[PDB]
Design a protein around this ligand. Structure first.
Ligand SMILES: Nc1nc2c(ncn2[C@@H]2O[C@H](COP(=O)(O)OP(=O)(O)O)[C@@H](OP(=O)(O)O)[C@H]2O)c(=O)[nH]1
Ligand SMILES: [Mg+2]
Length: 177
């Protein structure tokens, strides 16, 4: 319903996990992609998961936070993930430390070791927000080793940057059977 993601994604199977702190703009991203109905599943009371399935592309999304208590189920999703999209509210300096802590925990998860890392520096339409370079430094992305990563400036409201990021992801994502 969006445009040409059919040519991009083709018929390959990309299993994508999109997470980030609440308020980052993940749900906005899902709807803006216009790739399919956003499905809400609650595998466990209090744990809301949103999914979008487009041909062989799957997006699984949920909110994370500094005080998260990971559950076995989370790791079940992790094992089935080929690419991770971590969404950041570029205009929230008060929570960038929290995002860093959460993302660092994920970078150290055994079950996510092979996933390529795409960071969405979202809400870039706000001039007072942090730049992608600032976010790259704060998250410590340059210290990442043996794992492809990329940071993309985005505005989920307008959809700007979303294709560029998913393009990188599609070209770098490593398939796992
Ligand atoms: N300026 C701006 N805002 C954005 C962007 N993306 C999402 N937002 C806004 O950020 C708030 C949270 O987005 P949402 O998708 O629900 O976040 P989440 O799902 O990650 O928790 C929403 O504000 P509301 O509660 O006011 O609707 C939404 O409109 C963006 O690129 N730029
Ligand atoms: Mg949401």
């Amino acid at each position: 319903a969006s445009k040409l993601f059919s040519n991009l994604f083709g018929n390959k199977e990309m299993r994508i996990l999109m997470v980030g702190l609440d308020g980052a703009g993940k749900t906005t991203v899902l709807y803006k992609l216009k790739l399919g109905e956003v499905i809400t599943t609650i595998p466990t009371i209090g744990f809301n998961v949103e999914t979008v399935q487009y041909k062989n592309i799957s997006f699984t999304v949920w909110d994370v936070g500094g005080q998260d208590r990971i559950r076995s189920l989370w790791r079940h999703y992790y094992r089935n993930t080929e690419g991770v999209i971590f969404v950041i509210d570029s205009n929230d300096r008060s929570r960038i430390g929290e995002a860093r802590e959460v993302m660092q925990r994920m970078l150290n998860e055994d079950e996510l070791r092979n996933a390529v890392w795409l960071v969405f520096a979202n809400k870039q339409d706000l001039p007072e927000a942090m730049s992608a370079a600032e976010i790259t430094e704060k998250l410590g992305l340059h210290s990442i080793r043996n794992r492809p990563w990329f940071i993309q400036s985005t505005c989920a409201t307008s959809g700007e940057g979303l294709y560029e990021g998913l393009e990188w992801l599609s070209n770098n994502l490593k398939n796992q059977s």
